[PDB]
Amino acid sequence: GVPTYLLPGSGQFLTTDDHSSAPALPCFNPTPEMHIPGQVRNMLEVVQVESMMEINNTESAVGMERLKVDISALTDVDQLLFNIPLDIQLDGPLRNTLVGNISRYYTHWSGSLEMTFMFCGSFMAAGKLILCYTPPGGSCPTTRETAMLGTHIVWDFGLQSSVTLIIPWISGSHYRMFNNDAKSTNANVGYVTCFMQTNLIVPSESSDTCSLIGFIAAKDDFSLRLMRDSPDIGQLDHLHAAEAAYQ
Amino acid sequence: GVPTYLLPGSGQFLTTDDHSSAPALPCFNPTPEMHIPGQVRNMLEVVQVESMMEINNTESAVGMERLKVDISALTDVDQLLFNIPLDIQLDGPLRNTLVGNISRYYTHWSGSLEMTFMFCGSFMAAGKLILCYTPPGGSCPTTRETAMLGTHIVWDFGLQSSVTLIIPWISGSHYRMFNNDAKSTNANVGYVTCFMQTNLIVPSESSDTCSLIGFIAAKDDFSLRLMRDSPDIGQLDHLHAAEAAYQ
Amino acid sequence: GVPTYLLPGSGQFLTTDDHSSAPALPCFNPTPEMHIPGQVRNMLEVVQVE
Amino acid sequence: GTHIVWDFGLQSSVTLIIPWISGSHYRMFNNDAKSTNANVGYVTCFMQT
Amino acid sequence: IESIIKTATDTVKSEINAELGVVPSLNAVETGATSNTEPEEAIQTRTVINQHGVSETLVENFLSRAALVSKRSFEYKDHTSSTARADKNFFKWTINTRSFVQLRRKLELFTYLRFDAEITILTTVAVNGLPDLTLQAMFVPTGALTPEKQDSFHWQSGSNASVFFKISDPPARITIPFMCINSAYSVFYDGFAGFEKNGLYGINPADTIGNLCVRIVNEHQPVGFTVTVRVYMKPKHIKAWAPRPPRTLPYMSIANANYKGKERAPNALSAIIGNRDSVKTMPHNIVN
Amino acid sequence: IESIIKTATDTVKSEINAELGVVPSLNAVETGATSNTEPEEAIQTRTVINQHGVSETLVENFLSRAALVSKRSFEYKDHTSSTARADKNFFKWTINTRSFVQLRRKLELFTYLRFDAEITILTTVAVNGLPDLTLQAMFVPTGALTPEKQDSFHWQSGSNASVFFKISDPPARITIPFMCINSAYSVFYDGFAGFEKNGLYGINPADTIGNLCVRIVNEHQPVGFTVTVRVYMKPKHIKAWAPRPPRTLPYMSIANANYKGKERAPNALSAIIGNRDSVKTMPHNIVN
Amino acid sequence: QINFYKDSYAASASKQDFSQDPSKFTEPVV
Amino acid sequence: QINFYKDSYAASASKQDFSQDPSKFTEPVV
Amino acid sequence: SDRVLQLKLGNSAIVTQEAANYCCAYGEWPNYLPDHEAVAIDKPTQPETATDRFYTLKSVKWETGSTGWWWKLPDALNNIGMFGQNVQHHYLYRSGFLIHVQCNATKFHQGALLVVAIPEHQRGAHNTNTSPGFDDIMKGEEGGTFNHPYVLDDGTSLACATIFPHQWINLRTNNSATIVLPWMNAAPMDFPLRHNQWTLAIIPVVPLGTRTTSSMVPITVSIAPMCCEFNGLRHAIT
Amino acid sequence: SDRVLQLKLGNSAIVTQEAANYCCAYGEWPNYLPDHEAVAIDKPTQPETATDRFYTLKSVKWETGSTGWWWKLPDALNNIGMFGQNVQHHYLYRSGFLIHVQCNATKFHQGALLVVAIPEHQRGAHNTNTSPGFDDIMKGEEGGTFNHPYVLDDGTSLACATIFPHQWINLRTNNSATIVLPWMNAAPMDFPLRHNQWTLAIIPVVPLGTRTTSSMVPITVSIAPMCCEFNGLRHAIT
């Protein structure tokens, strides 16, 4: 017949191989395809949707207080309000986001991010903020004179209640890794900080402690590769009733 | 020669695989095909044939009394005569039918049914019946005012001795399952009930207890998939003389 | 290489199978066919004789 | 019934169109406000929020 | 009217029908014809483009699933002291669809079947380490000379189609052709095989494929093994004629259609379908 | 606008923009739309021809990785003295994506999935030499008759798609088709299966594939073996609808989406992301 | 599909005959 | 790629559908 | 219009005035054996009027406690007339059948007859492993009474017996069923004395019931062979 | 320009003067079931004005300590008006929804509402392995209060809940979210009394805060079914 020989790699079950396999139910007629709304054909559709950052990932912020940042009227000039760890691949405010949870199924990621901050004060509350994306290399900037040298956006509080801090893809490498080393040149992204441009100024009938909801999506520049399993989920024992699926 | 490698699934005997195998008797000449009458090329030919329901699946109906429903003259108004469990896949009056026994070789079924009721009274016996297919969700309707809101047919007893209660395919899903759960939204079909429209009225020389033979076939809408082995047959031990087939 | 898988019936010696097999003596030249009288190409020639 | 939900902002007025829903072509006076030929319906107002 | 039907038929929409003379719900069972009342003709329907394929109900796909037809655990040891009834390292088997009831009830749905048997012989071994035994499965025709020993000279297979296979190999799969002298296998044979009145009723030997004499080619080893040989038949190239009522009662024997039924319903003689309380009692009722 | 996107998009160069009326950084989250501020529109960019392929983020490539769905070590021995709870040389398994959390969280990213299961059954064996056991993995539908013994007559597989395979062979790989009665598998089923109020919440049986009854075809051998059968499911031909928040809290059960969370952050109930000192405290700070 | 044998019965199962005639069963009348 | 089976679901994974529409997610507004 | 029916075969003829229709079994009308299907090489005798005619069997008393009646073909006709003499003198036969079952009662009687023609009705005996013998199957002209017609005496179902060529004699509607059977065998011809292809089966699904004076209601069966061939001439056997 | 919005459905109509936009969910507008996707063969009743209209639910008091509110559709509407009577009388329904959530306060109040419509919101109970029963899921017209809305009561994340069709009611900017939902089910139609496709979820991401006199700020929900079909007519259940 046909003179063949087995290569190395014969009879091995690679999990990610793509080969046609034997149909269990022959001449099966699957259910006809109905137009179900909202088909995802590519996971970067899911990533480019905005999703809330937990910038307030502190203690004494229990549950939903972690999603908003309380900013107040300040008596000092040009004070730091918050800074955001930009490690998508590591634990931090970007982790439980749509750009974060999907990228923790991957290792190498590229493309520009997109931070959107929705002010949730009163309509009478007037204020201005600066949102400085500092490219990495140095420490997180604590004064505004240090931070506004980087990429920033200055935001007035009026009719439109949100800016977009585009985090540009500034990297030497084409992609960026996970390493468990947040301080690596291949993994570190930079630092987004926020400072009072002027101040949060409310009248006597508005609440003095207004809020900021911080979103992050990715852009059309964004890309992911080198798929891995997510570290966001674990499994110590069998789940409950999993033994009852066999009974 | 040809560089090959064994996939997962090599050397395994799937029962339902479709591969050309080695002929035991080479250059065999099979017997020439003769036109034998009544070829079935598709099992839905067998299903679309009418076949008697055992609506009288009670005790004290021994054998053939289960195939007919005894209806009588009634002194009360608008009384229930019979109701039919519509679970083809489960045990009930539809089980020992051509639509039932073939569909118990399958799991998922679609398409409209077809109940035909042949009156077998005298020619002098005059009567009227309503045959209400109630789509599922609620209880089996016990009064006629409850049941005639559903799909029904009103049937006069004259020259033609049979109606067709078309059970329309009313389902959310494309198909319907077997589950051993007759009360499931994926499995339950509804309830066919029968009520006296007027009454069964016989003269003094006809028998007061006339009969109804209930048929069910399927329509051209009907369909079956996900083939399984039938629960209608079992095998506890070896059959008799099966050891003598080896001797 | 070529992704294959063994069917049921692999590695079994059916006696009546018809497959090309490995020649023991390669580039062998068989003896030339001489017209020998009375060739039977079909056993029903033998059967139709009284 | 027929309703309109009204936000208080720049525009300070809605129009509740009372549609002509009657069996008859016209409607009478009768001194009987509860008559099928005379009664028009009921406009009510509730706090939306 | 013979027509090619790949999917289930569409449903046309219909409107209010109030017509004298045309009574499509009224039909005649006494003619023997199944009622041609369309769902359009009975109730008021919408337009439904039905895309449900009917391909899994094909009789080819119905019966071409390799089902079990034979199973013998037989001892593999010294048979010099064993009785002259057990398998002395070989078993003959008259190839028989009737031994196992799942394939039997499927093949007894029809009266006449024209199929090619795709015999897959799964041999499996247990100890009374496992050996890699070689097995011969010599196909003997119906009534021909079956061997008497393991090492008898009938196994030399001058013309009988033996298949030699190992336990460590994939299962031996051969294709038995359509081997009936008639144009179809008489699944039910209302008649007798012999011309005398001693013939067995229902057993047409034309329906019988033949013998499947299976031995273990190796000699006897010092420890005994229990070798179980499962035979799986896949009917293929199937033409089927005259369908029948599916058998409801349990089978009693492989030689005939005797019936006893269960003791109680379901599948009993006096009551095939399981009983309920009354004809107006709904067993699975949605009570809320 | 639906468009074919094979690589990530290029970045056009931009210049100094000082324009009234056009404020592309200012956007409205309250509309629900994600901000369309291009990087050209926010900062000053160069021309970048981005050649980064987006092909590994395809939902086909996302979910078609054969992940573990079942795992049972079960004893293979004499079961005449064992209790009537353990696996007497067979196990039934209702095929269930919910048992193992890596594939479960990936499939619970979406609401509706339309995939073909490429079931790979890896059987591995340990001694309590190794035998070359033959295994049957009979695919039973949801709720149908599952076998009661190892050598029961349900394993004859008249129509259920059994796959017979050995430990020494490569792992048995079959393709379960898209077997939902609906047009997609309801991964989350906000509703009840039954019409009565006793039905289990969230468990749609249409989402359930079926049973995977797996026995060892060999008889019991004099020494006992612990046979571990791992089942690997590869979703393929995948269409996916309505993506969801990925589950952050640990799973509690396979039947529902109950949550307890970790005791402390990360992945706790009161604190999903791990805590830090203040909102103005940078945890991984480059201090030189 | 493949069929490298010399016998036409040795091929794979012919699961393509979609011609059906139910009218010899549902309407067997003249 | 290869697909010597009679069933179209039995083929290899269709890793070629590069059509994406993020604007039903990023811009779901009217 | 289809209630009246005259069936002219040979010198025999049967009119019926309450007929339903006549069932051409499996959509197949009887014919002679064509040359491409023929096996026996000798010229078959085709008498065409001595056998192709209605041979009326003995009537059976349709009663209250009746279970059923069955006639196996051609075993019902192997001793009747010139069909019987052609059966006994020939090894082979190929013949369709035109069964016309007569059963009438008044317009006050009720009842239903499943007149069903079962091809290859391999009977089974009840509560034993012994196969039915020659006397249990080959009853001849008398026919046999069903023992358990609810399972058709072979473990199958009466409820699905309408998959066979069947008609109903509902005494309300009609009084005659007519089933036109073709040659139903895997072989083109066969030996008549040891094989029966069609089995006419007549079953009381609804029993005979009335409240008037109980006249005897019988069931008369008139089976006509159609398109008879006979090969293999020899001496008679009987 | 897009701040004013009048939504005319049936006899109902809703104007709003501080609107953001209206979210056509997944870029999909509701429609009737087309013939190629249709499954139920009977003609569906399409009332088109008795159900395709704004059914305004009960308002809920937006407070400081509030965790959230959720209404499951059509469970919120299975007892209201002619949508409720069509639900109780029919086995099947196919209806999109036009949710218009009203919540306004002064220009001195602050707060943010995540008005998010979750398809197939399989809830989970906290700190137990028992599934949520019928009373824990099918609250009806009242709706349910979130227990842990930070994880959306199913272990997922509120932070990623914007992957669903959502709008925000920021009391600074707007006062009405509007989400236009299509038929979101794998099946074309479904049984309404035991399944809910969309779950409107309303979550205080920023709580209600002010320093003025604490007026009651409620959240009013006006859900309009769109393009209703109903197959499978029977008696009512309720």
Tab-separated table of C-alpha atoms in Angstrom, chain I residues 112-195:
chain	number	residue	atom	x	y	z
I	112	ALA	CA	-64.659	-1.992	13.789
I	113	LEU	CA	-62.625	-4.508	11.811
I	114	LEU	CA	-58.913	-4.068	11.295
I	115	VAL	CA	-58.680	-5.882	7.969
I	116	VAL	CA	-54.890	-5.823	7.732
I	117	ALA	CA	-52.692	-7.865	5.392
I	118	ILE	CA	-49.417	-8.661	7.147
I	119	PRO	CA	-46.434	-9.624	4.958
I	120	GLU	CA	-44.325	-12.426	6.469
I	121	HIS	CA	-46.281	-12.865	9.679
I	122	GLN	CA	-43.882	-15.000	11.688
I	123	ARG	CA	-46.156	-15.967	14.560
I	124	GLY	CA	-44.978	-16.622	18.089
I	125	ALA	CA	-46.386	-18.962	20.688
I	126	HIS	CA	-47.257	-17.625	24.124
I	127	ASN	CA	-45.356	-18.478	27.331
I	128	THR	CA	-43.065	-21.081	25.767
I	129	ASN	CA	-39.746	-21.255	23.952
I	130	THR	CA	-40.973	-23.893	21.492
I	131	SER	CA	-41.587	-22.517	18.008
I	132	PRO	CA	-45.083	-22.902	16.525
I	133	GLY	CA	-45.261	-26.174	14.646
I	134	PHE	CA	-46.712	-27.006	11.270
I	135	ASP	CA	-50.253	-27.392	12.605
I	136	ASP	CA	-50.106	-24.075	14.472
I	137	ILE	CA	-49.176	-22.102	11.341
I	138	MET	CA	-50.505	-23.925	8.277
I	139	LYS	CA	-54.208	-24.054	9.117
I	140	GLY	CA	-55.305	-24.123	5.474
I	141	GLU	CA	-58.741	-23.023	4.308
I	142	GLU	CA	-60.163	-22.701	7.831
I	143	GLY	CA	-57.707	-20.066	8.988
I	144	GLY	CA	-56.741	-19.473	12.581
I	145	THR	CA	-58.166	-17.543	15.497
I	146	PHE	CA	-55.842	-15.027	17.131
I	147	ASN	CA	-54.773	-15.944	20.650
I	148	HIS	CA	-53.496	-12.476	21.606
I	149	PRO	CA	-54.366	-10.085	18.759
I	150	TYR	CA	-53.467	-7.087	20.903
I	151	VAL	CA	-49.852	-8.071	20.228
I	152	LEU	CA	-50.673	-9.727	16.838
I	153	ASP	CA	-49.410	-13.090	18.233
I	154	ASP	CA	-45.767	-12.137	17.632
I	155	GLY	CA	-44.956	-9.749	20.474
I	156	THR	CA	-45.417	-6.698	18.215
I	157	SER	CA	-48.239	-4.187	18.587
I	158	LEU	CA	-51.735	-4.141	17.152
I	159	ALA	CA	-51.610	-0.370	17.685
I	160	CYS	CA	-48.970	-0.047	14.959
I	161	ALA	CA	-50.523	-2.674	12.656
I	162	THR	CA	-51.727	0.112	10.354
I	163	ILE	CA	-48.164	0.313	8.995
I	164	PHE	CA	-49.164	-2.701	6.941
I	165	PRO	CA	-51.625	-2.528	4.043
I	166	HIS	CA	-54.915	-2.269	5.872
I	167	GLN	CA	-58.464	-1.064	5.629
I	168	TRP	CA	-61.169	-0.742	8.235
I	169	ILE	CA	-64.641	-2.195	8.173
I	170	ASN	CA	-66.463	0.183	10.459
I	171	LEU	CA	-70.047	-1.124	10.443
I	172	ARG	CA	-71.170	2.471	10.866
I	173	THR	CA	-69.502	3.609	7.630
I	174	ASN	CA	-68.794	0.721	5.256
I	175	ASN	CA	-69.179	-3.028	5.074
I	176	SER	CA	-66.328	-4.243	2.843
I	177	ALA	CA	-62.565	-3.774	2.919
I	178	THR	CA	-60.538	-4.374	-0.232
I	179	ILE	CA	-56.755	-4.780	-0.216
I	180	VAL	CA	-54.915	-5.385	-3.495
I	181	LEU	CA	-51.630	-7.156	-2.603
I	182	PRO	CA	-48.614	-7.446	-4.919
I	183	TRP	CA	-45.978	-10.169	-4.849
I	184	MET	CA	-44.274	-9.558	-1.512
I	185	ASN	CA	-41.262	-11.817	-1.302
I	186	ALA	CA	-37.519	-11.346	-1.440
I	187	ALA	CA	-37.477	-14.213	-3.925
I	188	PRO	CA	-39.347	-13.719	-7.215
I	189	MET	CA	-41.230	-17.025	-6.882
I	190	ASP	CA	-41.500	-19.462	-3.998
I	191	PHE	CA	-42.647	-22.886	-2.851
I	192	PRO	CA	-46.275	-22.480	-1.753
I	193	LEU	CA	-46.640	-25.485	0.525
I	194	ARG	CA	-43.923	-24.386	2.989
I	195	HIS	CA	-44.071	-20.576	2.849
